[PDB]
Enzyme design. Structure first.
Site, PDB file in Angstrom:
ATOM      1  N   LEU A 198      26.446  15.732   4.729  1.00 24.78           N
ATOM      2  CA  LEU A 198      27.796  16.287   4.730  1.00 24.78           C
ATOM      3  C   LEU A 198      27.845  17.639   5.435  1.00 24.78           C
ATOM      4  O   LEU A 198      26.926  18.447   5.324  1.00 24.78           O
ATOM      5  CB  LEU A 198      28.296  16.381   3.284  1.00 24.78           C
ATOM      6  CG  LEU A 198      28.433  15.027   2.557  1.00 24.78           C
ATOM      7  CD1 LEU A 198      28.717  15.284   1.081  1.00 24.78           C
ATOM      8  CD2 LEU A 198      29.459  14.168   3.163  1.00 24.78           C
ATOM      9  N   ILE A 228      25.877  23.714   2.343  1.00 20.39           N
ATOM     10  CA  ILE A 228      24.574  23.488   1.787  1.00 20.39           C
ATOM     11  C   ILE A 228      23.749  22.529   2.690  1.00 20.39           C
ATOM     12  O   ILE A 228      24.291  21.788   3.504  1.00 20.39           O
ATOM     13  CB  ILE A 228      24.607  22.915   0.358  1.00 20.39           C
ATOM     14  CG1 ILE A 228      25.311  21.546   0.272  1.00 20.39           C
ATOM     15  CG2 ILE A 228      25.250  23.914  -0.591  1.00 20.39           C
ATOM     16  CD1 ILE A 228      25.143  20.830  -1.076  1.00 20.39           C
ATOM     17  N   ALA A 248      19.560  -6.584  18.673  1.00 19.98           N
ATOM     18  CA  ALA A 248      19.302  -5.314  18.023  1.00 19.98           C
ATOM     19  C   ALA A 248      19.206  -4.239  19.066  1.00 19.98           C
ATOM     20  O   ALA A 248      18.658  -4.459  20.169  1.00 19.98           O
ATOM     21  CB  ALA A 248      18.028  -5.393  17.214  1.00 19.98           C
ATOM     22  N   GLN A 265      24.051  26.114   5.147  1.00 19.04           N
ATOM     23  CA  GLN A 265      23.696  24.834   5.809  1.00 19.04           C
ATOM     24  C   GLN A 265      22.851  25.104   7.037  1.00 19.04           C
ATOM     25  O   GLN A 265      23.135  26.056   7.783  1.00 19.04           O
ATOM     26  CB  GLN A 265      24.956  24.130   6.174  1.00 19.04           C
ATOM     27  CG  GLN A 265      24.723  22.795   6.873  1.00 19.04           C
ATOM     28  CD  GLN A 265      25.993  22.084   6.966  1.00 19.04           C
ATOM     29  OE1 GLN A 265      26.339  21.274   6.097  1.00 19.04           O
ATOM     30  NE2 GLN A 265      26.726  22.338   8.055  1.00 19.04           N
ATOM     31  N   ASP A 268      24.374  16.515  -0.828  1.00 16.83           N
ATOM     32  CA  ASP A 268      24.685  16.505   0.608  1.00 16.83           C
ATOM     33  C   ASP A 268      24.937  15.113   1.184  1.00 16.83           C
ATOM     34  O   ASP A 268      24.945  14.963   2.396  1.00 16.83           O
ATOM     35  CB  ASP A 268      23.632  17.295   1.404  1.00 16.83           C
ATOM     36  CG  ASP A 268      24.246  18.116   2.508  1.00 16.83           C
ATOM     37  OD1 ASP A 268      25.462  18.522   2.442  1.00 16.83           O
ATOM     38  OD2 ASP A 268      23.498  18.494   3.459  1.00 16.83           O
ATOM     39  N   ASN A 295       5.804   2.228  14.603  1.00 16.77           N
ATOM     40  CA  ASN A 295       4.912   3.359  14.634  1.00 16.77           C
ATOM     41  C   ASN A 295       3.451   3.066  15.055  1.00 16.77           C
ATOM     42  O   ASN A 295       2.603   3.939  14.820  1.00 16.77           O
ATOM     43  CB  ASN A 295       4.949   4.177  13.304  1.00 16.77           C
ATOM     44  CG  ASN A 295       6.380   4.624  12.935  1.00 16.77           C
ATOM     45  OD1 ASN A 295       7.208   4.928  13.809  1.00 16.77           O
ATOM     46  ND2 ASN A 295       6.715   4.586  11.645  1.00 16.77           N
ATOM     47  N   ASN A 308      29.111  21.034   5.236  1.00 17.42           N
ATOM     48  CA  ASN A 308      29.554  21.883   4.150  1.00 17.42           C
ATOM     49  C   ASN A 308      28.756  23.177   4.160  1.00 17.42           C
ATOM     50  O   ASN A 308      28.265  23.557   5.265  1.00 17.42           O
ATOM     51  CB  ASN A 308      29.493  21.072   2.826  1.00 17.42           C
ATOM     52  CG  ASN A 308      28.123  20.520   2.574  1.00 17.42           C
ATOM     53  OD1 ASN A 308      27.102  20.977   3.177  1.00 17.42           O
ATOM     54  ND2 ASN A 308      28.066  19.491   1.699  1.00 17.42           N
ATOM     55  N   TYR A 359      14.557  -8.073  19.268  1.00 19.16           N
ATOM     56  CA  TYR A 359      15.617  -9.042  19.504  1.00 19.16           C
ATOM     57  C   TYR A 359      16.702  -8.492  20.343  1.00 19.16           C
ATOM     58  O   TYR A 359      17.085  -7.352  20.148  1.00 19.16           O
ATOM     59  CB  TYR A 359      16.182  -9.591  18.206  1.00 19.16           C
ATOM     60  CG  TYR A 359      15.185 -10.406  17.417  1.00 19.16           C
ATOM     61  CD1 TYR A 359      14.429 -11.414  18.044  1.00 19.16           C
ATOM     62  CD2 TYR A 359      14.972 -10.187  16.059  1.00 19.16           C
ATOM     63  CE1 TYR A 359      13.524 -12.134  17.330  1.00 19.16           C
ATOM     64  CE2 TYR A 359      14.021 -10.918  15.363  1.00 19.16           C
ATOM     65  CZ  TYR A 359      13.328 -11.905  15.994  1.00 19.16           C
ATOM     66  OH  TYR A 359      12.354 -12.681  15.334  1.00 19.16           O
ATOM     67  N   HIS A 412      12.432   7.208   1.532  1.00 16.87           N
ATOM     68  CA  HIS A 412      12.676   6.926   2.935  1.00 16.87           C
ATOM     69  C   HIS A 412      14.181   6.653   3.248  1.00 16.87           C
ATOM     70  O   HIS A 412      14.727   7.222   4.170  1.00 16.87           O
ATOM     71  CB  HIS A 412      11.830   5.716   3.265  1.00 16.87           C
ATOM     72  CG  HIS A 412      11.813   5.292   4.685  1.00 16.87           C
ATOM     73  ND1 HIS A 412      12.657   4.323   5.162  1.00 16.87           N
ATOM     74  CD2 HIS A 412      10.939   5.580   5.701  1.00 16.87           C
ATOM     75  CE1 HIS A 412      12.369   4.086   6.440  1.00 16.87           C
ATOM     76  NE2 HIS A 412      11.306   4.803   6.769  1.00 16.87           N
ATOM     77  N   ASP A 442      17.519  -0.229   3.610  1.00 13.27           N
ATOM     78  CA  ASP A 442      16.305   0.543   3.426  1.00 13.27           C
ATOM     79  C   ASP A 442      15.908   0.472   1.969  1.00 13.27           C
ATOM     80  O   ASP A 442      16.195  -0.502   1.306  1.00 13.27           O
ATOM     81  CB  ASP A 442      16.603   1.984   3.941  1.00 13.27           C
ATOM     82  CG  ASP A 442      15.396   2.695   4.495  1.00 13.27           C
ATOM     83  OD1 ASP A 442      14.443   2.977   3.741  1.00 13.27           O
ATOM     84  OD2 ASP A 442      15.333   2.956   5.740  1.00 13.27           O
ATOM     85  N   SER A 482      11.504   5.545  12.287  1.00 14.92           N
ATOM     86  CA  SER A 482      12.505   5.491  11.208  1.00 14.92           C
ATOM     87  C   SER A 482      13.470   6.679  11.217  1.00 14.92           C
ATOM     88  O   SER A 482      14.597   6.547  10.729  1.00 14.92           O
ATOM     89  CB  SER A 482      11.840   5.500   9.819  1.00 14.92           C
ATOM     90  OG  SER A 482      11.188   4.276   9.605  1.00 14.92           O
ATOM     91  N   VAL A 485      21.734  20.175   4.965  1.00 11.36           N
ATOM     92  CA  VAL A 485      21.588  19.848   6.396  1.00 11.36           C
ATOM     93  C   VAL A 485      22.914  19.274   6.889  1.00 11.36           C
ATOM     94  O   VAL A 485      23.977  19.475   6.270  1.00 11.36           O
ATOM     95  CB  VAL A 485      20.341  18.975   6.661  1.00 11.36           C
ATOM     96  CG1 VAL A 485      19.078  19.753   6.301  1.00 11.36           C
ATOM     97  CG2 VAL A 485      20.402  17.677   5.929  1.00 11.36           C
TER      98      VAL A 485
HETATM   99 CA   LIG Z   1      25.351  19.896   4.416  1.00  8.07          CA
END
Ligand SMILES: [Ca+2]
Ligand SMILES: *Cc1ccc(-c2ccc(C)cn2)nc1
Ligand code: NI
Length: 269
Positions: A73, A77, A168, A2, A40, A153, A75, A165, A62, A32, A215, A79
């Site tokens: 996650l 593996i 938000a 990871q 993952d 962007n 773990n 708003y 996206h 999205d 984003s 990210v």
């Molecule tokens: Ca992971």
């Protein structure tokens, strides 16, 4: 093996993880393009408001990328998300093209409020205001959802809707030097910033990819909100938003940065 994307470290998520804060018990909706099944990610549920795409799987990429910044996650593996135990919900409001309508987005927000979401991540926006959208932001907020949205962007000194708003929480993007990214919108209504350049996350095809944008910043803050909620289960959306801002690191300009850089260590102390 990871890896920890630089932005996850920049917001100091690992310090919170070392206190046992992972976002467990916190429901985060990603509004999205969908979220693809991925080794993952743990996707708990969701809904689609895009006609013609009845499934919540991601035909764009996206939404899956955004989701991984929140909740990849922890773990051996891939990210690692800001809130790797968050309860992740795929709320498809944008099609495979990456576009959706204000109605689809509003339906996602009403789903989130009807289904007990604590956080809704909206890595989307438009330069024009929308009564339909605003109404749904306020409705979700009244139902206890913390709505977190990208500033946009265009590089302009004004921010997109719905981030503009009041209900938000508006998120701009920083780079590895803690400067505003050139594209990151700023100005009135900006609440906070997070990493948004060269952000590696989960991507469909069971792989990983790097993207730039507000984003990508937004989900860092959505994840940080989940950490704060796990530590403080009684707190409201407004309480969490204010604590994130109060604990952010100043970057030397309210106009450009709002409260500054989100800091998950300071927010979970
Ligand atoms: Ca992971
Ligand atoms: C075919 C393909 C694969 C990956 C991508 C991609 C990766 C990352 C980002 C930010 C955007 N697009 N596009 C097309
Ligand atoms: Ni692409």
């Amino acid at each position: 093996a990871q890896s920890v994307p630089w932005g996850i470290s920049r917001v100091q998520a690992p310090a919170a993880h070392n206190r046992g804060l992972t976002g467990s018990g916190v429901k985060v909706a990603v509004l999205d393009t969908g979220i693809s099944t991925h080794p993952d990610l743990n996707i708990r549920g969701g809904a689609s408001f895009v006609p013609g795409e009845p499934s919540t799987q991601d035909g764009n990429g996206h939404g899956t990328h955004v989701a991984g910044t929140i909740a990849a996650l922890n773990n051996s593996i891939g990210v690692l998300g800001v809130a790797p135990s968050a309860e992740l919900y795929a709320v498809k409001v944008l099609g495979a093209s990456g576009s959706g309508s204000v109605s689809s987005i509003a339906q996602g927000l009403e789903w989130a409020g009807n289904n007990g979401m604590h956080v809704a991540n909206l890595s989307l926006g438009s330069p024009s205001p929308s009564a339909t959208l605003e109404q749904a932001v306020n409705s979700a907020t009244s139902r206890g959802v913390l709505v977190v949205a990208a500033s946009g962007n265009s590089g302009a000194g004004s921010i997109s809707y719905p981030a503009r708003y009041a209900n938000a929480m508006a998120v701009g993007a920083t780079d590895q030097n803690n400067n505003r990214a050139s594209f990151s919108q700023y100005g009135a209504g900006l609440d906070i910033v997070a990493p948004g350049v060269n952000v590696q996350s989960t991507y469909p095809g069971s792989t990983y990819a790097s993207c730039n944008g507000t984003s990508m910043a937004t989900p860092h803050v959505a994840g940080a909100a989940a950490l704060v909620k796990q530590k403080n289960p009684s707190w409201s959306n407004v309480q969490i938003r204010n604590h994130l801002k109060n604990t952010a690191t100043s970057l030397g300009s309210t106009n450009l940065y709002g409260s500054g850089l989100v800091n998950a260590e300071a927010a979970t102390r």
